[PDB]
Amino acid sequence: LPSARWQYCGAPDGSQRAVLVQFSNGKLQSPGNMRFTLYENKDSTNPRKRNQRILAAETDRLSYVGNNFGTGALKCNTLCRHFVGILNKTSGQMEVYDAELFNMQPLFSD
C-alpha cells in the first residue's frame, strides 16, 4: 500500500500557520476570482487576543467572513487540530504544517 515518510517541518516559532477555508453554504464554483485578506489583532501583549484573526473573502456579489474567536469560532478548531501535508511524489516524503481552519460566512449590515 502506498505510504509516505512523515516530517513536521511545521512552523519555526509556531507563530507561522497556514490557512484553510470552509464555506458554510457549500463550494465556491469559482474560487479563482476571490480575494482573501487575513486580519490579525493589533494587541500582541494579550495572549487571549494575540491569536484572534479574521479572514475576509470578497467577491463581486457578496463578502464572506470567518473568525477564529467568538460564536463564529467553532469547536473543531480546538477539540481537533488541523494540518496540511505536502507530499513529494518523487521522494515519498510528506511535510506536515500547522493549519488554521476558517469557516466562511456572507456579509451584510443594517
Binding site: 474560487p31 479563482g32 480575494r35
Partner: protein, 51 residues
C-alpha cells in the same frame, strides 16, 4: 499580494489514538458457581425414644 485558493487537496488523513484487545480468558468469579448446601460429617442422632 493577497491570499488565493490553491489546488484541491488530493487526500485526507484522520488520526485517532487506539489501544488493542487482550486474550479472552473470561475469569467469571473469585469463588465461582452457586456452591451447594451440604451434610455436616457424622452428625449423629440428637434424640432417642423412651423405654
Amino acid at each position: 499580494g493577497g491570499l488565493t485558493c490553491a489546488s484541491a487537496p488530493q487526500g485526507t488523513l484522520r488520526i485517532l489514538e487506539g489501544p488493542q484487545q487482550s486474550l479472552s480468558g473470561s475469569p467469571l468469579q473469585p469463588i465461582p458457581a452457586s456452591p451447594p448446601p451440604q451434610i455436616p460429617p457424622g452428625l449423629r442422632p440428637r434424640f432417642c425414644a423412651f423405654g
